[PDB]
Amino acid sequence: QSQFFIEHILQILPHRYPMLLVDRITELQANQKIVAYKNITFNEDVFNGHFPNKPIFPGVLIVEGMAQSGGFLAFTSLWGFDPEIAKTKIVYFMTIDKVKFRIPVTPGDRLEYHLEVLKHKGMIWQVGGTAQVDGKVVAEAELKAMIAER
Amino acid sequence: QSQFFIEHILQILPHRYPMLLVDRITELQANQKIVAYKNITFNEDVFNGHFPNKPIFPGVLIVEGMAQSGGFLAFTSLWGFDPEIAKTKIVYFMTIDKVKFRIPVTPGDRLEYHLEVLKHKGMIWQVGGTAQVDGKVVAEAELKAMIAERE
Amino acid sequence: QFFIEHILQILPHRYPMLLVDRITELQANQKIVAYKNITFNEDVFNGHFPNKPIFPGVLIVEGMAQSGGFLAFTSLWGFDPEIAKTKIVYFMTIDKVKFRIPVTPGDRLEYHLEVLKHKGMIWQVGGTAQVDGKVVAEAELKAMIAER
Amino acid sequence: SQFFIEHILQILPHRYPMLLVDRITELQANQKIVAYKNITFNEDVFNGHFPNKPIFPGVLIVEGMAQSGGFLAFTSLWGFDPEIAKTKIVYFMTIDKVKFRIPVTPGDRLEYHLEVLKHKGMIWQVGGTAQVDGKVVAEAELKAMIAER
Amino acid sequence: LQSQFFIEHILQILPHRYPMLLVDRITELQANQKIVAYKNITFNEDVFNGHFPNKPIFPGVLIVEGMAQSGGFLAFTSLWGFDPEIAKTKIVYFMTIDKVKFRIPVTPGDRLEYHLEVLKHKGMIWQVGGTAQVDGKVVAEAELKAMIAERE
Amino acid sequence: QSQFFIEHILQILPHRYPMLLVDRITELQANQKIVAYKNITFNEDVFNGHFPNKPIFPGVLIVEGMAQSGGFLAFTSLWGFDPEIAKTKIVYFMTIDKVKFRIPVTPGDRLEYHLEVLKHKGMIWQVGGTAQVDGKVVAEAELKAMIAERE
Ligand SMILES: O=C(N/N=C/c1cc(Br)c(O)c(Br)c1O)c1ccc(Cl)cc1
Ligand SMILES: O=C(N/N=C/c1cc(Br)c(O)c(Br)c1O)c1ccc(Cl)cc1
Ligand SMILES: [Cl-]
Ligand SMILES: [Cl-]
Ligand SMILES: [Cl-]
Ligand SMILES: [Cl-]
Ligand SMILES: [Cl-]
Ligand SMILES: [Cl-]
Numbered sequence A: 001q002s003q004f005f006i007e008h009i010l011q012i013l014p015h016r017y018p019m020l021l022v023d024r025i026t027e028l029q030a031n032q033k034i035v036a037y038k039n040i041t042f043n044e045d046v047f048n049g050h051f052p053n054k055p056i057f058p059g060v061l062i063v064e065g066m067a068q069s070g071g072f073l074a075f076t077s078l079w080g081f082d083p084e085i086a087k088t089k090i091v092y093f094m095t096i097d098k099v100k101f102r103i104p105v106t107p108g109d110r111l112e113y114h115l116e117v118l119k120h121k122g123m124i125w126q127v128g129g130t131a132q133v134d135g136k137v138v139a140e141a142e143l144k145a146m147i148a149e150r
Numbered sequence B, F: 001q002s003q004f005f006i007e008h009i010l011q012i013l014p015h016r017y018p019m020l021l022v023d024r025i026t027e028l029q030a031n032q033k034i035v036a037y038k039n040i041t042f043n044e045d046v047f048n049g050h051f052p053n054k055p056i057f058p059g060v061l062i063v064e065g066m067a068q069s070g071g072f073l074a075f076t077s078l079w080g081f082d083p084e085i086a087k088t089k090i091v092y093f094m095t096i097d098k099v100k101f102r103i104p105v106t107p108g109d110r111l112e113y114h115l116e117v118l119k120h121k122g123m124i125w126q127v128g129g130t131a132q133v134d135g136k137v138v139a140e141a142e143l144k145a146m147i148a149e150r151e
Numbered sequence C: 001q002f003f004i005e006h007i008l009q010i011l012p013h014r015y016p017m018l019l020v021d022r023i024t025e026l027q028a029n030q031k032i033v034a035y036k037n038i039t040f041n042e043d044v045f046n047g048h049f050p051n052k053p054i055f056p057g058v059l060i061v062e063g064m065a066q067s068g069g070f071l072a073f074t075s076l077w078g079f080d081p082e083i084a085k086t087k088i089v090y091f092m093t094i095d096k097v098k099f100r101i102p103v104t105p106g107d108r109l110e111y112h113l114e115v116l117k118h119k120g121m122i123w124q125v126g127g128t129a130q131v132d133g134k135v136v137a138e139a140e141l142k143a144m145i146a147e148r
Numbered sequence D: 001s002q003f004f005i006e007h008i009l010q011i012l013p014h015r016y017p018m019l020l021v022d023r024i025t026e027l028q029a030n031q032k033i034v035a036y037k038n039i040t041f042n043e044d045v046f047n048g049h050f051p052n053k054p055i056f057p058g059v060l061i062v063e064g065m066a067q068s069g070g071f072l073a074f075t076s077l078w079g080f081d082p083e084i085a086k087t088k089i090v091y092f093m094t095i096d097k098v099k100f101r102i103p104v105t106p107g108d109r110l111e112y113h114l115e116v117l118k119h120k121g122m123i124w125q126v127g128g129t130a131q132v133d134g135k136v137v138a139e140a141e142l143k144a145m146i147a148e149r
Numbered sequence E: 001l002q003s004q005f006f007i008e009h010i011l012q013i014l015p016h017r018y019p020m021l022l023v024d025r026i027t028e029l030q031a032n033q034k035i036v037a038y039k040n041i042t043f044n045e046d047v048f049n050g051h052f053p054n055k056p057i058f059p060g061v062l063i064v065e066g067m068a069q070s071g072g073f074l075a076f077t078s079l080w081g082f083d084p085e086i087a088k089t090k091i092v093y094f095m096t097i098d099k100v101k102f103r104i105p106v107t108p109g110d111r112l113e114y115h116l117e118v119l120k121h122k123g124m125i126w127q128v129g130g131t132a133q134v135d136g137k138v139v140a141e142a143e144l145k146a147m148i149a150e151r152e
Helices: A007-014 A059-079 B006-012 B060-081 C003-011 C056-075 D005-011 D058-078 E005-011 E060-078 F007-011 F059-079
Strands: A024-029 A035-039 A089-101 A109-121 A122-133 A136-149 B024-029 B033-039 B089-101 B110-121 B125-135 B137-151 C021-027 C031-037 C085-100 C108-119 C120-129 C134-147 D023-028 D034-038 D088-100 D107-122 D123-132 D135-148 E026-028 E033-042 E090-102 E111-122 E124-132 E139-152 F024-029 F032-041 F089-101 F109-121 F124-133 F136-149
Touching: A007 A024, A007 A059, A024 A059, A024 B024, A035 A059, A059 A109, A059 A122, A059 A136, A059 F059, A059 F089, A089 E026, A089 F059, A136 B033, B006 B024, B006 B060, B024 B060, B033 B060, B060 B089, B060 B110, B060 B125, B060 B137, B060 C056, B060 C085, B089 E033, B110 C031, C003 C021, C021 C056, C031 C056, C056 C085, C056 C108, C056 C120, C085 C120, C120 E033, D005 D023, D005 D058, D023 D058, D034 D058, D058 D107, D058 D123, D058 D135, D058 E060, D058 E090, D088 E060, E005 E026, E005 E060, E026 E060, E033 E060, E060 E090, E060 E111, E060 E124, E060 E139, F007 F024, F007 F059, F024 F059, F032 F059, F059 F089, F059 F109, F059 F124, F059 F136
Parallel strands: none
Antiparallel strands: A024 A035, A035 A109, A089 A136, A089 F089, A109 A122, A122 A136, B024 B033, B033 B110, B089 B137, B089 C085, B110 B125, B125 B137, C021 C031, C031 C108, C085 C134, C108 C120, C120 C134, D023 D034, D034 D107, D088 D135, D088 E090, D107 D123, D123 D135, E026 E033, E033 E111, E090 E139, E111 E124, E124 E139, F024 F032, F032 F109, F089 F136, F109 F124, F124 F136
């Protein structure tokens, strides 16, 4: 497909509350790129501690959302939307590089992940891109993952 | 004076996690109307139970969100943006009428509240409006809440 | 009576949105009496409100809808956990609700719903929420049972 | 003789999700207390105790009796005094003769019945039962120690 | 029957789940005799939000609960060995708790070690006693009798 | 000093539940290095979703933990144990580089943070190091953080 909602995302990723950080897929081009996003609301538990009276979505969780997006891209590229096969795979994330945070993310923001395949050799996938809020780059990162059996 | 962010909301409304359901205020007209919104994400505890495998933002919480929007409008119309006064006030729901849910709200939606003051007298405010997602009415509601000093 | 275990087999709601603990009375297509205990040990109170525990008015209504939901499921298909696991419930309308007394921890929130009208999966009920014999709230609502 | 959650919050230092006393229905200084905690499915504890079979932890029933006994010990000496309450801490040294007879589930009103067995200085020993609708669901003896915060 | 079991194995034997599964690993196990396990204590636990604000103390009753779960694992395990399918139909219940003594407060950063020994077993009835230790020191003492019952 | 417990960490770091991922500091050298750790237990909410029936501590949270240790070093380096000045600040992640995840971290693990100061000037600190479990490197990373006025 091209558009995947939360119910579809749930069938592909093993992630669940409170670590499923991708609400909807707006664009998906097999083996090339994925545009998705996660809404940022105050009503999230992480905001209880990050930080009191100063709600700021954790930079490491922006990268996690990006990794998740990359993982969905990789998986669908190999087997498409296949819930059955999804249950038998795992995407190990081996490395993270060139991460830069330019603007803080906060409640009310629509955190949009933009990832593209940088390299794919065998079970290894290298993805990179940015996270954006209303058109502006809020962060960037590269990630390398390996695909294996669960 | 017309747009407020989560920090400004925290200084006005007494609500807190997991019952602070307004993330940002986009426009505000004293004693008249207010437009605000709350982002809906899967990463909300309410979804563990509503319902398993089928994330649906609870209709009653959409109404709560509209009430809180009215509350913000009510408080600032009264004392303006005054945190020290807001600090010791709570808000009680008095009545709810003519609410209709038209479209289910799910993760990924930007729930936009549109409230207009139908009548107010002292601490008693009567608002009515809609909750919208991508310009479409997903809910209609009318409510009356009371602002009161913690005692 | 129907205890939490039975309620779980019929209603699709789960933590932290399952707000009915026990069903004390049930009369098909007529009325249902049930309740939910209110204790400080509930997450909602962390935010409603700090230093002043007030059970949310909208949750009192949710508790009434669920009570009504249980009446709809059983009136429709009897106590059938199998048919129940395929359905969910949507709120359609809420009207004429009034809150008279705040519900707080230590209260036994009793739901009293009667059937006003029904047709197919669409049920309209109304009644009150009571604490120690006094009406703390009134309400009318219409909900729809659907295939998830 | 009757304290509601706000009063309880001013005396006990416990907070969510460890404040296990909702209301105090009876209190005789140096003698006894009767209080209760409502049990509802809407409690986080039930997610794991246990999945598909909600049962209020027996050790949490004891904790509730401890908190009640500590509330008794404290108010007996200083009464309803929020200010002093902040300068003291009632922790427990021992717990004994505990027995569980009936499982406590969502829908039950868990009533704590503690009495002062003996006390000397800041060391108080209470004991009694946990009851649901008139029946004994548990019994226990505890020895608290009141010290400076 | 092995002597070391990790969380993956504990999850298959005990029915407890978040936030009441209080045993993270088993370091030694001896059928009908004893068990040594532990639970890591971190600030990132919901219980510390209210016990207590600004002064995180791991609840004494939870230390006891942890010892009971250890004894429970030992009991079931001594009887059926590592049998997940059967474990799934049994459940251990507290019958009594006696001689509980709290000696030292447990706090975030501590490794709460459970040392339980079988004082008497007879069918589904098990009486165990032991201590909760932190860095070699006894922080708690307890004794309890449990029952292995049917889940239905 | 050289060792701080949870009560000291609370008075310095702005992080609270569920994002305070450092439990104890075992070694600290002003402007040079720090060794701290966070206990890993199944009794953590994060494990409900990462992942069901297969608890693994999130790699990004391991880095976050290293960042917090660095932040604790940075602050006490410039102000010592000063709770009054500590509450007038937060820390912002600026960059992360060279992170390798070698071994999965699970309940029962004592996640040890080893960080050294690579560069530092003003409120800008650059640290790098590893996260260890029973003396084995389970991860590596470099990061730059900034201590900023709460405003
Ligand atoms: O160690 C694991 N790493 N990654 C799992 C995983 C799987 C997919 Br599919 C994915 O898109 C991503 Br991102 C993952 O992290 C893992 C191990 C077991 C399970 Cl059941 C799930 C995940
Ligand atoms: O320190 C204990 N209990 N409570 C302590 C405590 C609580 C709050 Br509230 C407080 O502000 C402070 Br000063 C305390 O020491 C304790 C003392 C002994 C054991 Cl064996 C276990 C716990
Ligand atoms: Cl950050
Ligand atoms: Cl709904
Ligand atoms: Cl209300
Ligand atoms: Cl139990
Ligand atoms: Cl304790
Ligand atoms: Cl990971």
